[PDB]
PDB file of C-alpha atoms and ligand atoms in Angstrom:
ATOM      1  CA  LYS Q 486     -69.627  80.667  -3.642  1.00  0.00           C
ATOM      2  CA  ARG Q 487     -71.703  81.939  -6.568  1.00  0.00           C
ATOM      3  CA  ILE Q 488     -75.188  83.370  -5.995  1.00  0.00           C
ATOM      4  CA  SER Q 489     -77.336  83.190  -9.128  1.00  0.00           C
ATOM      5  CA  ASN Q 490     -81.083  83.069  -9.828  1.00  0.00           C
ATOM      6  CA  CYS Q 491     -81.775  84.163  -6.246  1.00  0.00           C
ATOM      7  CA  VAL Q 492     -83.334  87.132  -4.467  1.00  0.00           C
ATOM      8  CA  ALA Q 493     -82.074  88.181  -1.044  1.00  0.00           C
ATOM      9  CA  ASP Q 494     -82.373  90.909   1.579  1.00  0.00           C
ATOM     10  CA  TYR Q 495     -79.299  92.488   3.162  1.00  0.00           C
ATOM     11  CA  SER Q 496     -81.327  93.955   6.042  1.00  0.00           C
ATOM     12  CA  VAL Q 497     -81.170  90.665   7.958  1.00  0.00           C
ATOM     13  CA  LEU Q 498     -77.398  90.545   7.358  1.00  0.00           C
ATOM     14  CA  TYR Q 499     -76.971  93.787   9.332  1.00  0.00           C
ATOM     15  CA  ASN Q 500     -79.310  93.578  12.357  1.00  0.00           C
ATOM     16  CA  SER Q 501     -77.348  90.645  13.826  1.00  0.00           C
ATOM     17  CA  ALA Q 502     -75.438  93.045  16.144  1.00  0.00           C
ATOM     18  CA  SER Q 503     -72.599  90.522  16.448  1.00  0.00           C
ATOM     19  CA  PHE Q 504     -70.017  91.551  13.823  1.00  0.00           C
ATOM     20  CA  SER Q 505     -66.867  93.045  15.327  1.00  0.00           C
ATOM     21  CA  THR Q 506     -65.989  94.790  12.047  1.00  0.00           C
ATOM     22  CA  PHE Q 507     -67.700  95.826   8.816  1.00  0.00           C
ATOM     23  CA  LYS Q 508     -66.193  97.744   5.891  1.00  0.00           C
ATOM     24  CA  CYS Q 509     -67.941  98.054   2.539  1.00  0.00           C
ATOM     25  CA  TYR Q 510     -66.375 100.157  -0.225  1.00  0.00           C
ATOM     26  CA  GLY Q 511     -67.546 101.112  -3.700  1.00  0.00           C
ATOM     27  CA  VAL Q 512     -71.159 101.765  -2.655  1.00  0.00           C
ATOM     28  CA  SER Q 513     -72.913 103.433   0.263  1.00  0.00           C
ATOM     29  CA  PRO Q 514     -73.946 100.717   2.765  1.00  0.00           C
ATOM     30  CA  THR Q 515     -77.449 102.186   3.193  1.00  0.00           C
ATOM     31  CA  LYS Q 516     -78.246 102.136  -0.554  1.00  0.00           C
ATOM     32  CA  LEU Q 517     -77.036  98.762  -1.845  1.00  0.00           C
ATOM     33  CA  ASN Q 518     -80.206  96.649  -1.645  1.00  0.00           C
ATOM     34  CA  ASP Q 519     -82.142  98.841  -4.089  1.00  0.00           C
ATOM     35  CA  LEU Q 520     -79.219  98.867  -6.531  1.00  0.00           C
ATOM     36  CA  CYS Q 521     -79.277  95.852  -8.849  1.00  0.00           C
ATOM     37  CA  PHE Q 522     -76.222  93.833  -9.896  1.00  0.00           C
ATOM     38  CA  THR Q 523     -75.621  90.696 -11.970  1.00  0.00           C
ATOM     39  CA  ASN Q 524     -73.593  88.237  -9.866  1.00  0.00           C
ATOM     40  CA  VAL Q 525     -72.385  88.073  -6.261  1.00  0.00           C
ATOM     41  CA  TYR Q 526     -69.100  86.334  -5.415  1.00  0.00           C
ATOM     42  CA  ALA Q 527     -68.433  85.262  -1.822  1.00  0.00           C
ATOM     43  CA  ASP Q 528     -65.207  83.806  -0.414  1.00  0.00           C
ATOM     44  CA  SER Q 529     -64.746  82.400   3.095  1.00  0.00           C
ATOM     45  CA  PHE Q 530     -61.446  81.995   4.946  1.00  0.00           C
ATOM     46  CA  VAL Q 531     -59.998  82.503   8.415  1.00  0.00           C
ATOM     47  CA  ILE Q 532     -57.511  85.170   9.497  1.00  0.00           C
ATOM     48  CA  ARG Q 533     -55.811  86.405  12.663  1.00  0.00           C
ATOM     49  CA  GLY Q 534     -56.769  89.520  14.603  1.00  0.00           C
TER      50      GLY Q 534
ATOM     51  CA  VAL K1279     -75.370  58.367 -14.912  1.00  0.00           C
ATOM     52  CA  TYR K1280     -71.855  59.819 -14.721  1.00  0.00           C
ATOM     53  CA  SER K1281     -68.382  59.059 -13.395  1.00  0.00           C
ATOM     54  CA  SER K1282     -67.655  62.211 -11.363  1.00  0.00           C
ATOM     55  CA  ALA K1283     -68.166  65.976 -11.246  1.00  0.00           C
ATOM     56  CA  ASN K1284     -65.963  68.976 -10.481  1.00  0.00           C
ATOM     57  CA  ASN K1285     -67.892  72.254 -10.106  1.00  0.00           C
ATOM     58  CA  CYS K1286     -71.191  73.969 -10.917  1.00  0.00           C
ATOM     59  CA  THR K1287     -73.602  76.587  -9.583  1.00  0.00           C
ATOM     60  CA  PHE K1288     -77.237  75.815 -10.431  1.00  0.00           C
ATOM     61  CA  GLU K1289     -79.257  73.116  -8.673  1.00  0.00           C
ATOM     62  CA  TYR K1290     -83.050  72.824  -8.507  1.00  0.00           C
ATOM     63  CA  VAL K1291     -85.286  70.380  -6.620  1.00  0.00           C
ATOM     64  CA  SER K1292     -88.918  71.639  -6.684  1.00  0.00           C
ATOM     65  CA  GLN K1293     -91.811  69.555  -5.346  1.00  0.00           C
ATOM     66  CA  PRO K1294     -91.543  65.761  -4.975  1.00  0.00           C
ATOM     67  CA  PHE K1295     -93.051  63.677  -7.773  1.00  0.00           C
ATOM     68  CA  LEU K1296     -93.909  59.983  -7.469  1.00  0.00           C
ATOM     69  CA  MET K1297     -93.637  57.234 -10.091  1.00  0.00           C
ATOM     70  CA  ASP K1298     -94.302  53.505 -10.254  1.00  0.00           C
ATOM     71  CA  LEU K1299     -91.090  51.497 -10.625  1.00  0.00           C
ATOM     72  CA  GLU K1300     -92.913  48.346 -11.787  1.00  0.00           C
ATOM     73  CA  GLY K1301     -92.703  47.736 -15.534  1.00  0.00           C
ATOM     74  CA  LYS K1302     -95.304  45.791 -17.505  1.00  0.00           C
ATOM     75  CA  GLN K1303     -95.952  44.748 -21.112  1.00  0.00           C
ATOM     76  CA  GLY K1304     -99.542  45.986 -21.412  1.00  0.00           C
ATOM     77  CA  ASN K1305    -101.059  48.801 -23.420  1.00  0.00           C
ATOM     78  CA  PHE K1306    -100.261  52.416 -22.595  1.00  0.00           C
ATOM     79  CA  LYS K1307    -102.643  54.569 -20.561  1.00  0.00           C
ATOM     80  CA  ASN K1308    -100.966  58.011 -20.438  1.00  0.00           C
ATOM     81  CA  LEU K1309     -99.287  60.370 -22.899  1.00  0.00           C
ATOM     82  CA  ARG K1310     -96.581  62.868 -21.921  1.00  0.00           C
ATOM     83  CA  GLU K1311     -95.234  65.619 -24.185  1.00  0.00           C
ATOM     84  CA  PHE K1312     -92.193  67.805 -23.502  1.00  0.00           C
ATOM     85  CA  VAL K1313     -90.764  70.844 -25.302  1.00  0.00           C
ATOM     86  CA  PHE K1314     -87.225  72.091 -24.623  1.00  0.00           C
ATOM     87  CA  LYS K1315     -86.191  75.523 -25.908  1.00  0.00           C
ATOM     88  CA  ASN K1316     -83.204  77.844 -25.535  1.00  0.00           C
ATOM     89  CA  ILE K1317     -83.668  81.510 -26.495  1.00  0.00           C
ATOM     90  CA  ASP K1318     -80.845  83.854 -25.394  1.00  0.00           C
ATOM     91  CA  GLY K1319     -79.680  81.101 -23.046  1.00  0.00           C
ATOM     92  CA  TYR K1320     -83.025  80.848 -21.235  1.00  0.00           C
ATOM     93  CA  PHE K1321     -84.100  77.222 -20.821  1.00  0.00           C
ATOM     94  CA  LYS K1322     -87.805  76.510 -21.329  1.00  0.00           C
ATOM     95  CA  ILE K1323     -90.016  73.631 -20.165  1.00  0.00           C
ATOM     96  CA  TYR K1324     -93.497  72.940 -21.555  1.00  0.00           C
ATOM     97  CA  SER K1325     -95.398  69.808 -20.552  1.00  0.00           C
ATOM     98  CA  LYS K1326     -98.912  68.496 -19.928  1.00  0.00           C
ATOM     99  CA  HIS K1327    -100.002  64.953 -19.085  1.00  0.00           C
TER     100      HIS K1327
HETATM  101  C1  LIG S1866     -65.130  75.108 -12.999  1.00  0.00           C
HETATM  102  O1  LIG S1866     -63.755  74.715 -13.115  1.00  0.00           O
HETATM  103  C2  LIG S1866     -63.216  74.885 -14.436  1.00  0.00           C
HETATM  104  C3  LIG S1866     -61.809  74.336 -14.407  1.00  0.00           C
HETATM  105  O2  LIG S1866     -61.727  73.084 -15.074  1.00  0.00           O
HETATM  106  C4  LIG S1866     -63.278  76.357 -14.836  1.00  0.00           C
HETATM  107  O3  LIG S1866     -62.816  76.497 -16.174  1.00  0.00           O
HETATM  108  C5  LIG S1866     -64.704  76.878 -14.721  1.00  0.00           C
HETATM  109  O4  LIG S1866     -64.733  78.279 -14.966  1.00  0.00           O
HETATM  110  C6  LIG S1866     -65.269  76.594 -13.330  1.00  0.00           C
HETATM  111  N1  LIG S1866     -66.657  77.019 -13.246  1.00  0.00           N
HETATM  112  C7  LIG S1866     -67.072  78.003 -12.442  1.00  0.00           C
HETATM  113  C8  LIG S1866     -68.538  78.311 -12.482  1.00  0.00           C
HETATM  114  O5  LIG S1866     -66.298  78.618 -11.715  1.00  0.00           O
END
């Protein structure tokens, strides 16, 4: 999935309170929305526990 | 309009716009002008009925 010409908020992606795990390296998780990037690449697949 | 497609990212819909699908042989009653530009890859639309 490629996200282009869009504006989005990551606050609603965090207050779900349903994710069993969350790791996010390369940037502090509290200060990523204000930082601006060019493109966002998302991949979806299943995996075991 | 084409045979098939493989992959792309952008897709835009905007508001619905209605036409008349009946064709006649009478005189014209409207004039439409369009301008298409591309500066640094940015696509431009200019029109006025
Ligand atoms: C679409 O697929 C082609 C392979 O034919 C590839 O070269 C191209 O980079 C792909 N486009 C995107 C946006 O990934």
